[PDB]
Design a protein around this nucleic acid. Structure first.
Length: 69
DNA sequence: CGTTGCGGCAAAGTTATGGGTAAAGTCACACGTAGTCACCATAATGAAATAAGATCACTACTGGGCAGTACCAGACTCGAACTGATG
């Protein structure tokens, strides 16, 4: 398979326009989502994903508490 | 004969209902709930008092007997004297 891949890339070139920088933005571009797609912002704890409470200071806003995000 | 509308048949499509399973929520652990007057009938004495009872003192009324007196004899006892038998 490696020799065939090398020969095929030699015939077909590199096609640098398809190059993608493996940065953090791409990482966020390839993340999944839970089944519900939202979560409830508990006071002081955060949002529950797979029994783990993820926290961000943006949750401190009064109108975002207990709201579906 | 061909076309067109109508109706039976049986999957197929849509709601509903009672099950199972992971996963987002939910909430108490944070020293604490028991606690306190108000209430009027019943026992239960202890005191207050009884209503009758008990006794003193006085006033008046009415039975009623004892120490002493007195007579009229009958009857036994005996001074004093008479009188007869006797050793």
């Amino acid at each position: 398979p490696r020799d065939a891949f090398a020969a095929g890339m030699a015939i077909g070139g590199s096609r640098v326009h398809r190059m993608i920088p493996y940065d953090e933005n791409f990482q966020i571009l390839t993340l999944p989502t839970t089944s519900e797609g939202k979560a409830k912002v508990q006071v002081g704890r955060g949002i529950k994903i797979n029994y783990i409470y993820y926290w961000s200071n943006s949750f401190r806003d009064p109108q975002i508490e207990n709201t579906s995000v």
